[PDB]
Amino acid sequence: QVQLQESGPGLVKPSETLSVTCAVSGVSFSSFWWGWIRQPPGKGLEWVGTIYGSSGRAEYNPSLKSRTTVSRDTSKSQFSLELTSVTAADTAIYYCSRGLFQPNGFSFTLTSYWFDVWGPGVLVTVSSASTKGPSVFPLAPTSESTAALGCLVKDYFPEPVTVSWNSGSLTSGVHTFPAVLQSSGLYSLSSVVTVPSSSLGTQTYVCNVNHKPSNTKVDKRVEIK
């Protein structure tokens, strides 16, 4: 019935303004209250703000009020969020939602909001780092039945990189780890694969690493030294 779709720039520079918009379909936009909720990587959910579709009256989380503006465009069935002076603490999946509420039993007062429908959300990352393609180094191993090899994919920005093994033909036993942010501001990860030890001196292993934002492609051969 109700559909919601967030959109935004995936990357915002520090101290600049983070802008995200939600498109709504399938309902009378003006009849409802609309909210923003965010989830920073590795942290919990945090309500940002809510706005009345009709009047445009908005409510903010006290933690963000000094930096936050929520708006709406009734003709477009959209509402928007602007967060100023952003830092890395503002890196988060930003969700739009509908906020419902009801009379709480006491005079003139209402509950706050629960959220009955949410969009899939959009990741926005705050960083001043400049685009950079990765460096790729072989991770080379043999007296057990299986052996591990891999590729270190280091010092790139922004996410993502894709890693395949032998142009895709090698898929089982592969673990490409979640990238971690270095104090550099650059990402690093390893992709590893376990293979039969007997195959080490006979088969070829190459990791294929693609980083679209820098138009980088590296093929690196991994072999025992």
């Binding site: 919990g44 509420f101 709480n104 629960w114 991770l139 971690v180 690093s188």
Partner: protein
């Protein structure tokens, strides 16, 4: 003002189980508590509002109870699609606040990590900056500890860990720990060791190499 604390933060379960998640509010919130289900990369979904009303469409195996400060989400006879992260949320008073979340992950038989250590390639050595990588492959449960010892000296700082999401087929985790050093530093020591602690190992395993072998 009002905070809500969940328990547990992590739950290991298997399909068929009946599981309960508790939510405690820092002060009374009447019945104004909602429960959500979150799966990686998908839209959050509300399960329960007003502490116990089921949202239409949601399976009746979900149920909520409680009032005042203490609340419970119960999933009876868990299905595989129910493995997810659950959040409670009070909406008695502004701002709405959420619990820290309960991740329900798949239980399996204990499996010791297979452990590997990779010295830096000669290409990386020539670059002047090196990375030593320790791999812990396909283990369960998630809880694992890695220590770096260089010539017997515990190295703290200058390493980072990364851990995979639970494997959708075999229910295991894998972990990397990456030690970063100038080549100059690297070259000034001999033995590099990765020492690993895990429930599946009755004694800790140490994988090491001699620089240059």
């Amino acid at each position: 003002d009002i905070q809500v604390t969940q328990s547990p933060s992590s739950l290991s379960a298997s399909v068929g189980d009946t599981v309960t998640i508790t939510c405690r509010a820092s002060q009374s919130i009447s019945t104004w508590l909602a429960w959500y289900q979150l799966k990686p990369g998908k839209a959050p979904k509300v399960l329960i509002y007003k502490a116990s009303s089921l949202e239409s469409g949601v399976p009746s195996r979900f149920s909520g109870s409680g009032s005042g400060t203490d609340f419970t989400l119960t999933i009876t006879t868990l299905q595989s699609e129910d493995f997810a992260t659950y959040y409670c949320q009070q909406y008695s008073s502004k701002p709405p606040t959420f619990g820290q979340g309960t991740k329900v992950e798949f239980k399996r038989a204990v499996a010791a990590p297979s452990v590997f250590i990779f010295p830096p390639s000669e290409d990386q050595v020539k670059s002047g900056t090196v990375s030593v990588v320790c791999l812990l492959n396909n283990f369960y449960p998630r809880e694992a500890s890695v220590k770096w010892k260089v010539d017997g000296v515990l190295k703290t700082g200058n390493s980072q860990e990364s851990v995979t999401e639970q494997d959708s087929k075999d229910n295991t985790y894998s972990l990397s720990s990456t030690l970063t050093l100038s080549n100059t530093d690297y070259q000034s020591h001999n033995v590099y060791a990765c020492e690993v602690t895990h429930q599946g190992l009755s004694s800790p395993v140490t994988k090491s190499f001699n620089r240059g072998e």
